[PDB]
């Protein structure tokens, strides 16, 4: 996460760390939607070009973590993947069309001050919230800067960063990149005229894009960190996996598959 700020304690109870058993490592971001279900971007799991193709065996999920690096004894909860669920229409091979993965946890995770699930947006939460101008909250433990030779300083965040980015208009999203955009995705970030900073970055993907509803006081997951071109680039925007458009796959699985 670029041009963000360190998160606050329990500022994001649903954040999930996709930790690589070995090499010991951060795979992506993820989000707690249940005591047992975890949302992630599909591509954190499967990306042929980087040759990504993790078996559930290979990962652990770390929920309730503030520190990136520390292993937080008594606040964080490290989980085992029971079963991974990838979007069937996920197109890595292109523009990452339907960048969504689900994981079922062998066992139920314990709610704490630090552990709690977010909401999934309803057709009406979405209609009203997912509007150009409206600000989302991007959380993760990814890059603080676009990968650069010339960049000096430590690129990894000690603590989880938080950045607030407004929803952009398709057209604008569309006119920004030569990539085929789709309805399965969205863009968030400061328009040029706005002269402001902050984006997610390499390692943030998998991570929630949440909006708070005036409507009833809850936090809803709007987008999954997907992709982009550069991080915090002038004229560029971040691309989110539009959760709602993709919700019925989500519910279908959770349903015949578990809780």
């Amino acid at each position: 996460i670029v041009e963000g700020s360190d998160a606050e304690i329990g500022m994001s109870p649903w954040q999930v760390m996709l930790f690589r058993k070995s090499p010991q490592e951060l795979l992506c971001g993820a989000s707690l939607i249940s005591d047992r279900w975890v949302l992630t971007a599909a591509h954190c799991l499967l990306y042929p070009p980087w040759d990504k193709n993790f078996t559930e065996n290979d990962l652990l999920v770390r929920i309730g973590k503030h520190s990136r690096t520390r292993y937080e004894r008594n606040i964080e909860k490290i989980s085992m993947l029971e079963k991974i669920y990838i979007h069937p229409r996920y197109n890595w091979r292109e523009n990452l069309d339907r960048d969504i993965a689900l994981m079922k946890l062998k066992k139920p995770v314990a709610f704490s001050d630090y552990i709690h699930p977010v909401c999934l947006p309803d057709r009406e939460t979405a209609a009203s919230l997912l509007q150009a101008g409206y600000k989302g909250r991007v959380t993760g433990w990814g890059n603080l800067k676009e990968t650069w030779t010339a960049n000096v300083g430590k690129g990894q965040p000690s603590v989880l960063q938080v950045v607030n980015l407004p929803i952009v208009e398709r057209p604008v999203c569309k006119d920004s990149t030569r990539i085929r955009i789709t309805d399965n995705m969205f863009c968030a970030g400061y328009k040029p005229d706005e002269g402001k900073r902050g984006d997610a970055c390499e390692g943030d993907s998998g991570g929630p894009f949440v909006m708070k509803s005036p409507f009833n006081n809850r936090w809803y997951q709007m987008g999954i960190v997907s992709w982009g071109e550069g991080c915090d680039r002038d004229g560029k925007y971040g691309f989110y996996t539009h959760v709602f458009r993709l919700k019925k796959w989500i519910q279908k699985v959770i349903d015949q598959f578990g809780e």
């Binding site: 930790f19 058993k21 070995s22 010991q24 490592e25 951060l26 652990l60 690096t69 520390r70 292993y71 490290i78 085992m80 990894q156």
Partner: peptide
């Protein structure tokens, strides 16, 4: 980089 975790998760 990453503090070791209980080799029980591992």
């Amino acid at each position: 980089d990453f503090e070791e975790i209980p080799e029980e998760y591992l």
